[PDB]
C-alpha cells in the first residue's frame, strides 16, 4: 500500500527549545515531491497541536502548507543540502541518497 | 528498503495535495 520509505529527523543544529522535533517514519509514492513532505510535516504537527498544551502552537490545520518547513538531505561532502520543493522523491533517491535503505531526510521550521 | 523499527499496524494516512497533485503519506509509530 505504498512505496519509498523514509525517516524524517529534526535538523541537528537548527532546532530550538519549543520547536516540535519529532522523528517521523513514513512511506509514500516516489512521485511525491519535497513540497508534499513539507506540507505533511506541517499537517501532522497541526493535528498533534489539537491536543497540545498550546503555549507555542504554530499551526492551523486549515492553512498548513509546504512553506512551513525546509527539507535537507546529507551529502557525502558532509553538507546538508536544501532540497527544492519541486523535486520528486524518486529524483531525490536517485540523485542524492544512493543507498539501499530507507531515505534519511532532515527538516527545519521556516525561516 | 523498508523501515525495521516501526509498528506497521499503527499506519495512519494523510492525503496531501500540493497544486493538483495528491499523494498518500502513511506514517508509523516507532516500535
From Swiss-Prot, chain A:
Effect of residue 40 to A: Reduced interaction with CBX7
Record-listed cross-link Glycyl lysine isopeptide (Lys-Gly) (interchain with G-Cter in SUMO2), residues: 27, 101
PTM section of the record: Monoubiquitinated, by auto-ubiquitination. Polyubiquitinated in the presence of UBE2D3 (in vitro).
Superkingdom of the source species: Eukaryota
Entry's localization field: Nucleus; Cytoplasm; Chromosome
Summary of subunit composition and partner proteins: Component of chromatin-associated Polycomb (PcG) complexes. Component of a number of PRC1-like complexes; these complexes contain either the polycomb group ring finger protein PCGF1, or PCGF2, or PCGF3, or PCGF4, or PCGF5, or PCGF6. Part of a complex that contains RNF2, UB2D3 and BMI1; within that complex RNF2 and BMI1 form a tight heterodimer, where UB2D3 interacts only with RNF2. The complex composed of RNF2, UB2D3 and BMI1 binds nucleosomes, and has activity only with nucleosomal histone H2A. Part of a complex that contains PCGF5, RNF2 and UBE2D3.
Miscellaneous information on this protein: The hPRC-H complex purification reported probably presents a mixture of different PRC1-like complexes.
Disease field: Luo-Schoch-Yamamoto syndrome: An autosomal dominant disorder characterized by intrauterine growth retardation, severe intellectual disability, behavioral problems, early-onset seizures, feeding difficulties, and dysmorphic features. White matter abnormalities and delayed myelination are observed on brain imaging.
Known function: E3 ubiquitin-protein ligase that mediates monoubiquitination of 'Lys-119' of histone H2A (H2AK119Ub), thereby playing a central role in histone code and gene regulation. H2AK119Ub gives a specific tag for epigenetic transcriptional repression and participates in X chromosome inactivation of female mammals. May be involved in the initiation of both imprinted and random X inactivation.
Protein name per its UniProtKB record: E3 ubiquitin-protein ligase RING2
Gene designation per UniProt: RNF2
UniProtKB/Swiss-Prot annotation, chain B:
Free-text description of this protein's post-translational modifications in UniProt: Monoubiquitinated.
Expression tissues: Down-regulated in breast cancer tissues and in several breast cancer cell lines (at protein level). Widely expressed with highest levels in lymphoid tissues and placenta.
Subcellular location: Nucleus; Cytoplasm; Nucleus, Nucleoplasm
Assembly behavior: Monomer. Component of repressive BCOR complex containing Polycomb group subcomplex at least composed of BCOR, PCGF1, RING1 and RNF2/RING2. Component of PCR1-like complexes. Interacts with PCGF1. Part of a PCR1-like complex that contains AUTS2, PCGF5, RNF2, CSNK2B and RYBP. Interacts with RNF2; the interaction is direct. Interacts with CBX2, YAF2, RING1 and RNF2. Interacts with ubiquitin and ubiquitinated proteins. Interacts with ubiquitinated histone H2A. Interacts with apoptin, DEDD, FADD, CASP8, CASP10, YY1 and GABPB1.
Domains (record comment): Intrinsically unstructured in the absence of binding partners. Folds upon binding to DNA or RNF2.
Protein task: Component of a Polycomb group (PcG) multiprotein PRC1-like complex, a complex class required to maintain the transcriptionally repressive state of many genes, including Hox genes, throughout development. PcG PRC1-like complex acts via chromatin remodeling and modification of histones; it mediates monoubiquitination of histone H2A 'Lys-119', rendering chromatin heritably changed in its expressibility. Component of a PRC1-like complex that mediates monoubiquitination of histone H2A 'Lys-119' on the X chromosome and is required for normal silencing of one copy of the X chromosome in XX females.
Protein name: RING1 and YY1-binding protein
Source organism of the structure: Homo sapiens
GN (gene name): RYBP
Amino acid at each position: 500500500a505504498s512505496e519509498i520509505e523514509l525517516v524524517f529527523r529534526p535538523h541537528p543544529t537548527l532546532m530550538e527549545k519549543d520547536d516540535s522535533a519529532q522523528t517521523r517514519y513514513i512511506k509514500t509514492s516516489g512521485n511525491a515531491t519535497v513540497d508534499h513532505l513539507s506540507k505533511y510535516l506541517a499537517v501532522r504537527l497541526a493535528l498533534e497541536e489539537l491536543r497540545s498544551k498550546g503555549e507555542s502552537n504554530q499551526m492551523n490545520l486549515d492553512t498548513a502548507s509546504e512553506k512551513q518547513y525546509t527539507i535537507y538531505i546529507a551529502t557525502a561532502s558532509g553538507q546538508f543540502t536544501v532540497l527544492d520543493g519541486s523535486f520528486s522523491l524518486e529524483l531525490v533517491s536517485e540523485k542524492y541518497w544512493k543507498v539501499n535503505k530507507p531515505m534519511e531526510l532532515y527538516y527545519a521550521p521556516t525561516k | 528498503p523498508r523501515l525495521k523499527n516501526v509498528d506497521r499496524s499503527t499506519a495512519q494516512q494523510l492525503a496531501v495535495t500540493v497544486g493538483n497533485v495528491t499523494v498518500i503519506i502513511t506514517d508509523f509509530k516507532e516500535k
